[model samples]
Target: KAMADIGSTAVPRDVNGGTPPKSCSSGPVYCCNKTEDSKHLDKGTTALLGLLNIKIGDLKDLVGLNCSPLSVIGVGGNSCSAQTVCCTNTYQHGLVNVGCTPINIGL
Candidate 1:
Protein backbone atom coordinates (compact mmCIF):
# COMPACT_ATOMS: atom_id res chain seq x y z
CA LYS A 1 0.00 0.00 0.00
CA ALA A 2 1.03 3.58 -0.55
CA MET A 3 0.30 6.83 1.25
CA ALA A 4 -2.32 9.10 -0.25
CA ASP A 5 -1.15 12.42 -1.67
CA ILE A 6 -1.60 15.37 0.68
CA GLY A 7 -2.82 17.90 -1.84
CA SER A 8 -5.18 20.59 -0.51
CA THR A 9 -8.50 21.49 -2.16
CA ALA A 10 -9.56 24.31 0.15
CA VAL A 11 -9.69 27.97 -0.89
CA PRO A 12 -6.26 29.59 -0.79
CA ARG A 13 -5.75 32.10 2.01
CA ASP A 14 -3.20 33.52 4.44
CA VAL A 15 -2.13 30.22 5.93
CA ASN A 16 0.55 32.15 7.76
CA GLY A 17 -2.08 34.02 9.76
CA GLY A 18 -5.40 32.26 9.78
CA THR A 19 -6.13 28.75 10.89
CA PRO A 20 -5.14 26.01 8.47
CA PRO A 21 -7.01 22.78 7.96
CA LYS A 22 -6.40 19.80 10.20
CA SER A 23 -4.50 18.16 7.36
CA CYS A 24 -1.83 20.84 7.52
CA SER A 25 -1.13 20.06 11.17
CA SER A 26 0.68 16.88 10.20
CA GLY A 27 3.52 18.57 8.35
CA PRO A 28 5.31 21.80 7.57
CA VAL A 29 3.67 24.05 4.98
CA TYR A 30 5.98 26.01 2.74
CA CYS A 31 4.79 29.23 1.15
CA CYS A 32 7.43 30.53 -1.25
CA ASN A 33 7.84 34.22 -2.13
CA LYS A 34 6.74 34.87 -5.70
CA THR A 35 5.88 38.55 -5.33
CA GLU A 36 8.44 39.78 -7.89
CA ASP A 37 8.04 36.76 -10.15
CA SER A 38 5.77 37.47 -13.10
CA LYS A 39 6.23 34.17 -14.82
CA HIS A 40 3.12 32.58 -13.34
CA LEU A 41 1.07 35.72 -12.69
CA ASP A 42 -1.34 35.07 -15.54
CA LYS A 43 -2.21 31.57 -14.51
CA GLY A 44 -1.75 31.97 -10.76
CA THR A 45 -3.54 35.31 -10.40
CA THR A 46 -6.29 34.28 -12.79
CA ALA A 47 -7.00 31.20 -10.74
CA LEU A 48 -6.74 33.16 -7.51
CA LEU A 49 -9.09 35.97 -8.48
CA GLY A 50 -11.42 33.58 -10.21
CA LEU A 51 -11.87 31.72 -6.95
CA LEU A 52 -12.53 34.96 -5.08
CA ASN A 53 -14.95 36.26 -7.72
CA ILE A 54 -12.83 39.38 -8.15
CA LYS A 55 -11.15 41.14 -11.07
CA ILE A 56 -7.59 42.28 -11.66
CA GLY A 57 -8.79 45.88 -11.71
CA ASP A 58 -9.93 45.42 -8.11
CA LEU A 59 -6.34 44.63 -7.17
CA LYS A 60 -5.05 48.06 -8.14
CA ASP A 61 -5.00 49.28 -4.54
CA LEU A 62 -3.35 46.11 -3.27
CA VAL A 63 0.40 45.69 -2.99
CA GLY A 64 2.99 43.32 -4.44
CA LEU A 65 1.89 40.76 -7.00
CA ASN A 66 -1.28 40.42 -4.92
CA CYS A 67 -0.21 36.81 -4.59
CA SER A 68 3.04 36.36 -2.80
CA PRO A 69 4.60 33.25 -1.25
CA LEU A 70 2.55 30.84 -3.33
CA SER A 71 2.08 27.75 -1.21
CA VAL A 72 3.98 24.54 -2.06
CA ILE A 73 3.50 22.22 0.85
CA GLY A 74 4.46 18.55 1.16
CA VAL A 75 7.08 19.01 -1.55
CA GLY A 76 10.82 19.51 -1.72
CA GLY A 77 12.33 22.99 -1.57
CA ASN A 78 10.11 25.72 -3.01
CA SER A 79 8.83 23.69 -5.95
CA CYS A 80 5.16 23.18 -6.66
CA SER A 81 3.63 19.88 -5.73
CA ALA A 82 0.69 17.94 -7.11
CA GLN A 83 -1.59 20.66 -5.75
CA THR A 84 0.12 24.05 -5.63
CA VAL A 85 -1.62 27.15 -4.23
CA CYS A 86 -1.19 30.87 -5.04
CA CYS A 87 -0.72 33.30 -2.15
CA THR A 88 -0.27 37.00 -1.29
CA ASN A 89 0.67 39.27 1.63
CA THR A 90 0.47 43.03 1.25
CA TYR A 91 -0.28 46.31 3.04
CA GLN A 92 -3.63 47.88 2.31
CA HIS A 93 -4.36 51.29 3.85
CA GLY A 94 -1.56 50.84 6.37
CA LEU A 95 -2.87 47.37 7.26
CA VAL A 96 -1.68 43.93 6.26
CA ASN A 97 -3.77 41.79 3.91
CA VAL A 98 -3.01 38.32 2.67
CA GLY A 99 -4.66 35.59 0.60
CA CYS A 100 -4.07 32.38 -1.31
CA THR A 101 -5.76 29.93 -3.74
CA PRO A 102 -5.15 26.54 -5.26
CA ILE A 103 -3.80 26.73 -8.83
CA ASN A 104 -3.25 24.19 -11.56
CA ILE A 105 0.22 24.11 -13.07
CA GLY A 106 0.95 22.62 -16.49
CA LEU A 107 4.08 21.05 -15.17
Candidate 2:
Protein backbone atom coordinates (compact mmCIF):
# COMPACT_ATOMS: atom_id res chain seq x y z
CA LYS A 1 0.00 0.00 0.00
CA ALA A 2 1.12 3.52 -0.75
CA MET A 3 1.54 6.00 2.06
CA ALA A 4 -0.31 9.19 1.35
CA ASP A 5 1.81 12.31 1.60
CA ILE A 6 1.26 13.76 5.06
CA GLY A 7 -0.96 16.57 3.76
CA SER A 8 -2.59 14.77 0.86
CA THR A 9 -6.34 14.87 1.17
CA ALA A 10 -6.74 13.58 -2.36
CA VAL A 11 -4.66 10.46 -1.73
CA PRO A 12 -6.97 9.30 1.01
CA ARG A 13 -10.01 10.70 -0.69
CA ASP A 14 -9.22 8.72 -3.81
CA VAL A 15 -8.73 5.72 -1.57
CA ASN A 16 -12.11 6.25 0.01
CA GLY A 17 -13.83 6.78 -3.30
CA GLY A 18 -12.48 3.84 -5.27
CA THR A 19 -12.87 1.18 -2.63
CA PRO A 20 -15.90 -0.02 -0.79
CA PRO A 21 -14.08 -0.62 2.47
CA LYS A 22 -14.89 -0.14 6.12
CA SER A 23 -16.56 3.21 5.70
CA CYS A 24 -15.56 5.39 8.58
CA SER A 25 -14.73 8.59 6.71
CA SER A 26 -14.33 10.56 9.90
CA GLY A 27 -12.99 9.93 13.40
CA PRO A 28 -9.84 8.06 14.29
CA VAL A 29 -8.71 4.98 12.43
CA TYR A 30 -5.46 3.67 13.77
CA CYS A 31 -2.69 2.17 11.64
CA CYS A 32 0.81 0.89 12.04
CA ASN A 33 3.41 3.12 10.42
CA LYS A 34 5.53 0.11 9.57
CA THR A 35 3.27 -2.71 8.50
CA GLU A 36 -0.01 -1.14 7.46
CA ASP A 37 -1.66 1.96 6.01
CA SER A 38 -5.11 2.09 7.67
CA LYS A 39 -7.23 0.03 10.02
CA HIS A 40 -9.64 0.20 12.92
CA LEU A 41 -8.86 0.14 16.58
CA ASP A 42 -11.41 0.33 19.34
CA LYS A 43 -11.67 3.03 22.03
CA GLY A 44 -9.48 1.24 24.57
CA THR A 45 -6.47 2.37 22.50
CA THR A 46 -4.68 4.07 25.40
CA ALA A 47 -5.15 1.09 27.66
CA LEU A 48 -3.90 -1.12 24.85
CA LEU A 49 -0.68 0.86 24.73
CA GLY A 50 -0.33 0.60 28.49
CA LEU A 51 -0.59 -3.16 28.23
CA LEU A 52 2.68 -3.38 26.32
CA ASN A 53 4.73 -1.49 28.90
CA ILE A 54 3.41 -3.32 31.92
CA LYS A 55 3.67 -7.10 32.19
CA ILE A 56 3.82 -9.58 29.35
CA GLY A 57 1.19 -11.79 30.92
CA ASP A 58 -1.12 -8.89 31.70
CA LEU A 59 -2.24 -8.54 28.08
CA LYS A 60 -3.57 -12.03 27.64
CA ASP A 61 -7.00 -11.26 29.01
CA LEU A 62 -7.45 -8.31 26.68
CA VAL A 63 -7.60 -10.16 23.36
CA GLY A 64 -7.51 -13.54 21.69
CA LEU A 65 -4.45 -12.60 19.56
CA ASN A 66 -0.79 -12.99 20.47
CA CYS A 67 1.39 -10.87 22.74
CA SER A 68 4.89 -11.67 23.98
CA PRO A 69 7.77 -10.07 25.81
CA LEU A 70 10.97 -9.12 24.03
CA SER A 71 14.50 -8.06 24.91
CA VAL A 72 16.54 -5.56 22.93
CA ILE A 73 20.14 -4.45 23.04
CA GLY A 74 20.60 -0.80 23.75
CA VAL A 75 23.39 1.74 23.97
CA GLY A 76 26.56 1.14 26.08
CA GLY A 77 25.96 -2.60 26.40
CA ASN A 78 22.83 -2.35 28.50
CA SER A 79 19.48 -3.82 27.46
CA CYS A 80 15.85 -2.77 27.48
CA SER A 81 12.63 -4.67 28.01
CA ALA A 82 9.74 -4.51 25.56
CA GLN A 83 6.57 -6.24 24.52
CA THR A 84 5.02 -7.11 21.19
CA VAL A 85 1.34 -6.24 21.07
CA CYS A 86 -0.36 -7.73 18.04
CA CYS A 87 -3.44 -6.64 16.12
CA THR A 88 -5.21 -8.10 13.13
CA ASN A 89 -5.09 -6.32 9.80
CA THR A 90 -8.27 -4.89 8.30
CA TYR A 91 -8.34 -6.99 5.12
CA GLN A 92 -6.35 -10.06 5.96
CA HIS A 93 -5.70 -12.78 8.50
CA GLY A 94 -2.15 -11.57 9.16
CA LEU A 95 -1.04 -9.97 12.39
CA VAL A 96 1.21 -7.02 13.17
CA ASN A 97 2.58 -5.92 16.51
CA VAL A 98 3.10 -2.55 18.06
CA GLY A 99 6.21 -2.95 20.10
CA CYS A 100 6.44 -0.74 23.16
CA THR A 101 8.74 -0.13 26.08
CA PRO A 102 8.72 1.74 29.33
CA ILE A 103 11.39 4.31 30.16
CA ASN A 104 14.50 2.23 30.33
CA ILE A 105 15.90 2.29 33.85
CA GLY A 106 19.50 2.90 32.88
CA LEU A 107 21.05 5.21 30.36
Candidate 3:
Protein backbone atom coordinates (compact mmCIF):
# COMPACT_ATOMS: atom_id res chain seq x y z
CA LYS A 1 0.00 0.00 0.00
CA ALA A 2 1.10 3.56 -0.61
CA MET A 3 1.76 5.99 2.22
CA ALA A 4 -1.03 8.09 0.80
CA ASP A 5 -3.39 5.33 1.91
CA ILE A 6 -2.65 6.26 5.53
CA GLY A 7 -5.43 8.82 5.63
CA SER A 8 -7.96 6.89 3.62
CA THR A 9 -10.58 7.08 6.36
CA ALA A 10 -9.94 10.49 7.87
CA VAL A 11 -12.02 13.59 7.45
CA PRO A 12 -10.29 16.75 6.17
CA ARG A 13 -11.23 20.02 7.84
CA ASP A 14 -10.64 23.55 6.64
CA VAL A 15 -9.12 26.02 9.06
CA ASN A 16 -11.69 28.64 8.18
CA GLY A 17 -14.55 26.24 8.96
CA GLY A 18 -15.30 25.67 5.31
CA THR A 19 -16.49 22.18 4.46
CA PRO A 20 -14.75 20.18 1.75
CA PRO A 21 -16.98 18.85 -0.95
CA LYS A 22 -18.10 15.28 -0.31
CA SER A 23 -17.63 14.41 -3.97
CA CYS A 24 -15.57 15.56 -6.90
CA SER A 25 -17.66 18.00 -8.87
CA SER A 26 -15.64 18.06 -12.10
CA GLY A 27 -12.25 16.45 -11.92
CA PRO A 28 -11.13 12.83 -11.92
CA VAL A 29 -9.41 13.45 -8.61
CA TYR A 30 -10.81 14.27 -5.18
CA CYS A 31 -8.42 16.28 -3.04
CA CYS A 32 -8.38 18.40 0.11
CA ASN A 33 -8.17 22.05 -0.79
CA LYS A 34 -5.42 24.49 0.24
CA THR A 35 -7.74 25.92 2.90
CA GLU A 36 -6.97 22.91 5.08
CA ASP A 37 -4.68 24.08 7.83
CA SER A 38 -3.11 22.54 10.93
CA LYS A 39 -6.35 22.77 12.87
CA HIS A 40 -7.79 19.33 13.58
CA LEU A 41 -5.73 17.49 10.99
CA ASP A 42 -6.18 13.72 11.32
CA LYS A 43 -3.61 11.35 12.85
CA GLY A 44 -2.64 9.93 9.48
CA THR A 45 -2.17 13.38 8.05
CA THR A 46 0.00 14.45 10.98
CA ALA A 47 2.09 11.30 10.77
CA LEU A 48 2.66 11.70 7.06
CA LEU A 49 3.65 15.33 7.51
CA GLY A 50 6.12 14.42 10.24
CA LEU A 51 7.60 11.70 8.08
CA LEU A 52 8.22 14.30 5.42
CA ASN A 53 9.74 16.68 7.99
CA ILE A 54 6.98 19.15 7.26
CA LYS A 55 5.57 21.15 10.13
CA ILE A 56 1.84 21.54 10.58
CA GLY A 57 2.33 25.27 10.10
CA ASP A 58 3.74 24.49 6.65
CA LEU A 59 0.88 22.31 5.50
CA LYS A 60 0.14 24.87 2.84
CA ASP A 61 3.50 24.23 1.21
CA LEU A 62 2.65 20.66 0.42
CA VAL A 63 -0.01 21.90 -1.94
CA GLY A 64 2.70 23.30 -4.21
CA LEU A 65 4.57 20.02 -4.43
CA ASN A 66 3.96 17.72 -7.35
CA CYS A 67 1.26 15.08 -6.96
CA SER A 68 1.44 11.49 -8.13
CA PRO A 69 -0.73 9.96 -10.81
CA LEU A 70 -1.66 7.50 -8.08
CA SER A 71 -4.56 8.16 -5.76
CA VAL A 72 -5.42 7.06 -2.20
CA ILE A 73 -8.92 5.71 -2.06
CA GLY A 74 -11.62 5.91 0.63
CA VAL A 75 -10.54 9.25 2.08
CA GLY A 76 -13.16 11.28 4.05
CA GLY A 77 -15.16 8.18 5.01
CA ASN A 78 -18.77 7.39 4.03
CA SER A 79 -19.74 10.96 3.31
CA CYS A 80 -17.14 11.05 0.57
CA SER A 81 -17.05 8.64 -2.31
CA ALA A 82 -14.48 5.91 -2.79
CA GLN A 83 -13.20 7.98 -5.68
CA THR A 84 -11.97 10.47 -3.11
CA VAL A 85 -8.20 10.55 -3.38
CA CYS A 86 -5.81 11.27 -0.56
CA CYS A 87 -3.25 12.84 -2.88
CA THR A 88 0.34 12.61 -1.76
CA ASN A 89 3.31 14.92 -2.11
CA THR A 90 6.19 13.59 -4.19
CA TYR A 91 8.98 13.71 -1.68
CA GLN A 92 12.48 12.26 -2.13
CA HIS A 93 11.94 9.52 0.47
CA GLY A 94 8.65 8.61 -1.12
CA LEU A 95 5.12 9.84 -1.36
CA VAL A 96 4.12 11.69 1.81
CA ASN A 97 1.59 14.21 3.08
CA VAL A 98 -1.64 12.44 2.39
CA GLY A 99 -4.83 14.39 1.56
CA CYS A 100 -2.95 17.22 -0.15
CA THR A 101 -4.70 18.88 -3.02
CA PRO A 102 -3.39 18.24 -6.54
CA ILE A 103 -3.65 21.91 -7.38
CA ASN A 104 -3.10 24.97 -5.24
CA ILE A 105 -6.32 26.71 -4.27
CA GLY A 106 -7.20 29.70 -2.07
CA LEU A 107 -3.56 30.32 -1.34
Candidate 4:
Protein backbone atom coordinates (compact mmCIF):
# COMPACT_ATOMS: atom_id res chain seq x y z
CA LYS A 1 0.00 0.00 0.00
CA ALA A 2 1.24 3.44 -0.84
CA MET A 3 -0.02 4.89 2.44
CA ALA A 4 -1.63 2.65 4.99
CA ASP A 5 -3.20 4.37 7.98
CA ILE A 6 -3.47 2.29 11.10
CA GLY A 7 -6.03 3.35 13.64
CA SER A 8 -4.34 4.28 16.88
CA THR A 9 -5.92 5.71 20.02
CA ALA A 10 -5.73 9.48 19.61
CA VAL A 11 -3.89 11.56 22.19
CA PRO A 12 -2.68 15.10 22.77
CA ARG A 13 0.47 16.01 20.83
CA ASP A 14 2.20 17.38 23.95
CA VAL A 15 2.61 13.90 25.35
CA ASN A 16 2.43 10.31 24.20
CA GLY A 17 -1.06 8.72 24.32
CA GLY A 18 -1.16 8.45 28.08
CA THR A 19 -2.78 10.35 30.93
CA PRO A 20 -2.49 14.12 30.74
CA PRO A 21 -1.40 16.09 33.77
CA LYS A 22 -4.42 18.09 34.94
CA SER A 23 -2.04 20.71 36.33
CA CYS A 24 -0.63 21.53 32.94
CA SER A 25 -2.85 24.28 31.54
CA SER A 26 -1.09 24.78 28.17
CA GLY A 27 2.32 24.71 26.48
CA PRO A 28 4.73 21.95 25.44
CA VAL A 29 5.42 18.84 27.46
CA TYR A 30 8.50 20.30 29.10
CA CYS A 31 7.04 23.76 29.14
CA CYS A 32 3.93 23.33 31.26
CA ASN A 33 2.97 26.76 32.52
CA LYS A 34 2.47 25.31 35.98
CA THR A 35 5.39 26.31 38.17
CA GLU A 36 5.90 23.01 39.95
CA ASP A 37 5.44 20.92 36.85
CA SER A 38 7.88 23.02 34.89
CA LYS A 39 10.45 22.74 37.67
CA HIS A 40 10.19 18.96 37.64
CA LEU A 41 10.69 18.85 33.91
CA ASP A 42 13.71 21.13 34.08
CA LYS A 43 15.34 19.20 36.90
CA GLY A 44 14.85 15.86 35.17
CA THR A 45 16.24 17.00 31.82
CA THR A 46 19.42 18.39 33.39
CA ALA A 47 19.81 15.60 35.94
CA LEU A 48 20.95 13.24 33.21
CA LEU A 49 23.38 15.80 31.94
CA GLY A 50 25.73 15.02 34.79
CA LEU A 51 25.11 11.29 34.49
CA LEU A 52 25.72 11.19 30.74
CA ASN A 53 29.08 12.90 31.38
CA ILE A 54 28.05 15.59 28.93
CA LYS A 55 29.97 18.78 29.53
CA ILE A 56 27.57 20.69 27.33
CA GLY A 57 24.08 21.73 28.37
CA ASP A 58 22.27 20.30 25.34
CA LEU A 59 22.33 16.75 23.99
CA LYS A 60 22.19 18.04 20.42
CA ASP A 61 25.77 19.20 20.97
CA LEU A 62 26.92 15.58 20.83
CA VAL A 63 25.14 14.74 17.60
CA GLY A 64 28.30 14.47 15.56
CA LEU A 65 31.64 12.83 16.50
CA ASN A 66 31.96 9.18 17.56
CA CYS A 67 29.83 8.92 20.70
CA SER A 68 26.39 8.27 22.08
CA PRO A 69 23.72 8.26 19.40
CA LEU A 70 20.62 10.38 19.77
CA SER A 71 16.93 9.38 19.94
CA VAL A 72 16.41 10.39 16.35
CA ILE A 73 14.82 6.99 15.66
CA GLY A 74 16.01 5.89 12.18
CA VAL A 75 18.89 8.26 11.63
CA GLY A 76 21.97 6.39 10.49
CA GLY A 77 25.69 7.20 11.16
CA ASN A 78 25.35 6.51 14.84
CA SER A 79 27.87 4.39 16.72
CA CYS A 80 26.42 3.83 20.16
CA SER A 81 22.80 2.80 19.89
CA ALA A 82 20.60 5.74 20.84
CA GLN A 83 18.61 4.43 23.76
CA THR A 84 15.83 5.87 25.90
CA VAL A 85 15.07 4.85 29.49
CA CYS A 86 11.49 5.97 29.64
CA CYS A 87 9.13 5.35 32.48
CA THR A 88 5.45 5.41 31.26
CA ASN A 89 5.89 7.04 27.86
CA THR A 90 8.16 6.72 24.83
CA TYR A 91 7.82 10.42 24.00
CA GLN A 92 6.92 9.46 20.46
CA HIS A 93 5.09 6.19 20.89
CA GLY A 94 3.62 3.87 23.53
CA LEU A 95 6.27 2.92 26.11
CA VAL A 96 9.98 2.62 26.88
CA ASN A 97 11.58 -0.54 28.06
CA VAL A 98 13.80 -0.57 31.14
CA GLY A 99 17.34 -2.00 31.70
CA CYS A 100 18.33 -0.92 28.20
CA THR A 101 21.80 0.49 27.38
CA PRO A 102 20.77 4.05 27.85
CA ILE A 103 22.76 6.93 26.50
CA ASN A 104 19.78 9.18 26.96
CA ILE A 105 16.23 9.26 28.35
CA GLY A 106 13.42 11.79 28.26
CA LEU A 107 9.67 12.35 28.00
Candidates' C-alpha lDDT = 0.36, 0.29, 0.40, 0.26
Local lDDT at 36 for model 4: 18
Q: Which segments of model 1 are wrong by more than 4 Å? A: 1-32, 36-40, 61-107
Q: Write the per-residue lDDT of candidate 1 for residues 1-107, one digit (tens) a residue.
A: 12364364444533556433322332332233333222334565556545655555445332233222323432442453323344343333212223334433323
Worst 10 contiguous positions by lDDT, candidate 4 = 27-36
lDDT of residue 64 for candidate 1: 32
RMSD of 1: 14.7
- What local lDDT score does residue 96 receive in model 2, on the 0 to 100 scale? 26
Cα lDDT tens digits for candidate 2, 3-98 = 755654445435534432232222212232332211333435434434544332433222212322222223311221232223322211113243
Off by over 4 Å in 3: 1-39, 61-89, 92-94, 97-107
How would you order the candidates by TM-score, starting with the best?
3, 1, 4, 2
lDDT of 1 at 61: 30
C-alpha RMSD values across all candidates: 14.7, 16.3, 16.7, 15.1
Please name the candidate that would achieve the greatest TM-score relative to the true structure.
Answer: 3
Shift of residue 61 alpha carbon in model 4, Å: 6.9
Summed backbone clashes in each candidate are 5, 0, 0, 0
> Candidate 4 at residue 22, lDDT?
22
TM-scores vs. true structure, each candidate: 0.24, 0.17, 0.29, 0.18
**Per-residue lDDT tens digits of candidate 4, residues 1-107?**
21364345443444544342222222111211111111222444334434554333322211111122233333331222433222211121211111122222222
